[PDB]
Amino acid sequence: KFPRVKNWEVGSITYDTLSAQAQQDGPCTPRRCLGSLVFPRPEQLLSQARDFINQYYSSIKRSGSQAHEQRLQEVEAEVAATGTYQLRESELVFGAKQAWRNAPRCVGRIQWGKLQVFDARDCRSAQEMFTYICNHIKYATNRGNLRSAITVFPQRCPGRGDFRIWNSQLVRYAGYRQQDGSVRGDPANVEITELCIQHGWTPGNGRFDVLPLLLQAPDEPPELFLLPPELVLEVPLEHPTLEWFAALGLRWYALPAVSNMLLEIGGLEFPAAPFSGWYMSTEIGTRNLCDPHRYNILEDVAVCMDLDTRTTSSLWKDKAAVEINVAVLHSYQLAKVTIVDHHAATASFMKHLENEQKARGGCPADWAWIVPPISGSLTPVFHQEMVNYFLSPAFRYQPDPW
Amino acid sequence: FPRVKNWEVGSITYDTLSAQAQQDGPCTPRRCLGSLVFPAPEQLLSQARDFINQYYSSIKRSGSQAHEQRLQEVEAEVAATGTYQLRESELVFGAKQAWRNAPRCVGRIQWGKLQVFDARDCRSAQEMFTYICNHIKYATNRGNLRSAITVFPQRCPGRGDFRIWNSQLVRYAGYRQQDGSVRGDPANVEITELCIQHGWTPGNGRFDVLPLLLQAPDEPPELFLLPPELVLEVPLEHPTLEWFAALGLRWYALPAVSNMLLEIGGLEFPAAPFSGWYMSTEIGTRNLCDPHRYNILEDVAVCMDLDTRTTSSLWKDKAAVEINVAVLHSYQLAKVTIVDHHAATASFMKHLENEQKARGGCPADWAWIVPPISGSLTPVFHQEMVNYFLSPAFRYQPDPW
Ligand code: HEM
Ligand code: HEM
Ligand SMILES: CNCc1cc(C#N)cc(-c2cc(C)cc(N)n2)c1
Ligand SMILES: CNCc1cc(C#N)cc(-c2cc(C)cc(N)n2)c1
Ligand SMILES: C[C@H](O)[C@H](O)[C@H]1CNc2nc(N)[nH]c(=O)c2N1
Ligand SMILES: C[C@H](O)[C@H](O)[C@H]1CNc2nc(N)[nH]c(=O)c2N1
Ligand SMILES: [Cl-]
Ligand SMILES: [Cl-]
Ligand SMILES: [Gd]
Ligand SMILES: [Gd]
Ligand SMILES: [Gd]
Ligand SMILES: [Zn+2]
């Protein structure tokens, strides 16, 4: 009943006893595994609140002692009198760190203890959001010395609309169709780009136009917000030795800040809780720039490198991709913007796994997402067996607000 | 029915084939164990019955006289003997289905083109060896490799199993060294010591081909040396890094898995070696660059003048790419069949599309299908996959020692 977990590079073996605590059923059954699917599809609130409060108090070595029981009664009374409860500041903080710590697909969780939590739970109106989001971005960006941060907007309440950020991230590039359907800019954001335009935004022409924000106060159709350009830190992409690479005109932004995910703590739901860290270079260099449905630049870079693109066995794709990742790391470091390569990132994650084995008896890890999209087996996580499961508190995906 | 998305294209299918998943895998709704490497006549009858139904559907004779004849024949043979024998055509179909059903095999576009050698009359370890040598000779085909399987007698009550103790027909020895290191392939230290313990006179090279340890029923394993001219090998050189040849690296032409169990209609063939041809990343990335295998990555990178003192130079990625280039180039030079990971994953995408039409799905183990370098540069990365167990099947089995 305790999954045996082997590391095949070293031969070491552990048991994931933490998996025994998994709440939300995953997508897999004895009959079929659905682990590669990206998205795999009233007093229930007190059981989740009780569980979260007990978590909080064990983590401060204060289980079964005065303040713990007292806090147990106050949430009991709060839900009894109001049908919900409010998180203590320290709990909201602790829950944010735990949701991050529990994110199975996050390779950066060695950082999970260092998280700046901005409490925007007294927020009201999209204008207020924009200043919170702008405080977050400026704090997180910090002139390129990136700092992990989350801003927690008001929780979900019955019978009243949600706070929602319509953009999937706080910084996204536009995607413009043509007299031929095809896209100039980021093809991933064709939808939100067409929403921003349909809500008043004057579209640009370029391949790297920072989209405006669509911020949704409860029961209000959204409002457009132009992000201050001096607040959107971008990195022009150059290559250390390929002088023509800069002339390709590629850029990427500094701050990866996911703004479409729902933070769930102790049964409470925060559909607006944008979190940010810093990039792993393969996210930009491999996925964003080289995915065929993203900027799809692989062949252009290979033409410029004079690679033989006529045969797949020249591994021209592999070479061009590696140089793109080199350009990303070089450019971010030259711009003094925090970035981590997939080798450092995965080695730190192995350290995270070892810590968590000792601290909690295991670690929910989603192999397909932890292993980087290039050089998978050159990283140690490739050879590490992993167990994937849902712990609470958590970041969950949620439907598009339209 | 699971919904399955391709993210490169946007297309969506439903894996209705998974609903027929026979045996159960390791995952539950509580926890996914997809990443783990190694997760009674009545039930023999139902397995047999289902395989016979599969066979008669393949020959467009489902529900016919011959079909029921075979069902009744097998039921009465199981009643009288506890087991039954496959007809030759059923064995051929069952071996191909087992390949077709192998979720971690990216080469399955080829599944219909499989040469089946019926060695079920095999009598001894000496005859087993001859069959194996003929398999290797046929499959290698002077470098124009041909997919093949040799099926040795099935498990049956009252006699031990035929077993090949080697995990592949061609493996390089791994010698634990004077100072705890391994000379050769560290994956093969165990089988190497077994060969020595069974009378083999070791070498001391890094690429010494292992003898075969062949087990006839209720027999100790018997040592058989492969004639060197049967084992086609490829010296490894790089088209533009002339020092690469001086590494003295080699690999063999024929990937021939010999330790897996073939299961057809409830019958078990513990010895049924099968062989195809390599995908270059198995050699270039895993066998040569895994830290626990030949572990040549840093040595190559140092020779390439890469800056190995910092991970962000991507020296590892650069050196691995050139090792893979060297593998492809060397096998092409030698005129030994090889497929690179771009061509293999593109042909696997066609396999999934063919299988969606033919069967309504395809068991695929994403983490094994996605190559170990350049994952998201291949189309399979962006393909969601459903992993499940269909029979006939190749199964792992315990080592016989
Ligand atoms: C500090 C540096 C960080 C790095 C290098 C990092 C890296 C990554 C990467 C590469 C992914 C894969 C996403 C994809 O490829 O689409 C990911 C996912 C994710 N990360 Fe992190 N991240 C960091 C910080 C954070 C923070 C601060 C949070 C929240 C407080 C967080 C929570 C998540 C979540 C929710 C996901 C989605 C996958 C899941 O829900 O399991 N990460 N991260
Ligand atoms: C014809 C060219 C072939 C190619 C290019 C190919 C490719 C591969 C690769 C790359 C793997 C993963 C191995 C690893 O990383 O350890 C694999 C596994 C496997 N292949 Fe194939 N293969 C071929 C032929 C065959 C044949 C002829 C058979 C059997 C009749 C077969 C059955 C299997 C099996 C059983 C596995 C183990 C995975 C599982 O049990 O699901 N393959 N193959
Ligand atoms: C890979 N680019 C899209 C992306 C998707 C998701 C998710 N879910 C998460 C990230 C992300 C988030 C954070 C905090 C850091 C990071 N390096 N990536 C980035
Ligand atoms: C990748 N090196 C080890 C290896 C393990 C297993 C298994 N199971 C299978 C293969 C293999 C087998 C066949 C027939 C072809 C091929 N390219 N690889 C190779
Ligand atoms: C189909 C497949 O599961 C999907 O493309 C996944 C695979 N692994 C991933 N890993 C990361 N880090 N990010 C991703 O978007 C994905 N996508
Ligand atoms: C632990 C991890 O599952 C393991 O290293 C797997 C991952 N995917 C693989 N994929 C292939 N094709 N071959 C392998 O050996 C492995 N190893
Ligand atoms: Cl991103
Ligand atoms: Cl191999
Ligand atoms: Gd030029
Ligand atoms: Gd040269
Ligand atoms: Gd040397
Ligand atoms: Zn699973």
Q: How many CB atoms lie within 10 A of CB A204?
A: 14
Q: Is B388 in the pocket of ligand 2 (CB under 6 A)?
A: no
For the record, the structure tokens of B260 come out as 């897996």
Tell me the ligand closest to B304's alpha carbon.
10
Tell me the resolution in Å. 1.9
Q: Give the per-residue SS3 of B301-349.
A: HHHCCCCCCCHHHCHHHHHHHHHHHHHHHHHHHCCCCEECHHHHHHHHH
The response to whether A33 counts as a known ligand-binding position is: yes
Q: How many CB atoms lie within 10 A of CB B179?
A: 5
Q: List domains and CATH numbers for chain B.
A: 15-120+147-157+261-275+345-369 (3.90.340.10), 121-146+161-232+396-400 (3.90.440.10), 233-255+278-343 (3.90.1230.10)
Rounded to an integer, what distance in angstroms lies between the CA atom of residue B313 and that of residue A323? 10
Quickly tell me which residue has 């004895």 as its tokens. A30
Identify which of B4, B35, B381, B384 to mutate to test ligand 5's pocket (most ligand atoms within 8 A of the CB). B381
For the record, the structure tokens of B97 come out as 């289905």
What is the distance in angstroms between the Cα of A27 and the nearest Cα belonging to chain B? 6
Q: Which ligand 5 atom is nearest residue A38's CA? A: 3
Whether residue B7 and residue A293 make contact (CB cut-off 8 A), yes or no, is yes
Best residue in B27, B287, B293, B339 for a mutation probing chain A (most A CBs within 10 Å): B27
Rounded to an integer, what distance in angstroms lies between the CA atom of residue B230 and that of residue B133? 7
Looking at ligand 2, which residue's alpha carbon is closest to its atom 22? Answer: B107
Please indicate if any CB of chain A lies within 8 Å of the CB of B386.
yes
For the record, the structure tokens of B50 come out as 């289902």
SS3 at position B354: helix
Identify which of A93, A106, A115, A147 to mutate to test ligand 1's pocket (most ligand atoms within 8 A of the CB). A106
Residues of B in contact with A25 (CB under 8 A): 29-30
Q: What radius of gyration, in Å, describes the C-alpha atoms of chain B? A: 22
User: A357 Cβ partners below 8 Å, 6+ apart?
Assistant: A14, A363
**Burial of B95 from C-beta contacts in 10 A (0-12 / 13-18 / 19+):** buried
Using alpha carbons, list the distances in angstroms from residue B227 to A95, B3, B47, B213, B215.
Answer: 65, 51, 40, 14, 19
SS3 at position A395: strand
Answer for the pair A193, A176: CB distance below 8 angstroms, yes or no.
yes
Q: At what angle do helices A44-59 and A89-102 cross, to 10 degrees?
A: 90
Rounded to an integer, what distance in angstroms lies between the CA atom of residue B333 and that of residue B331? 5
A30 backbone φψ class: left, alpha, beta (φ>0; ψ -120 to 50): alpha
Rounded to an integer, what distance in angstroms lies between the CA atom of residue A380 and that of residue A342? 10
The response to whether B366 counts as a known ligand-binding position is: no
What phi, psi does B311 have (nearest 5°)?
-75, -25
* Helix spans in A142-256 (H): 190-197
Q: How many CB atoms lie within 10 A of CB B169?
A: 27
Distance A33 CA to ligand 12 centre (A): 4
Q: CB-side exposure of A141: number of CA atoms within 13 Å?
A: 20
- Among residues B313, B292, B286, which one has the least CA distance to residue B302? B313
Residues in chain B: 401
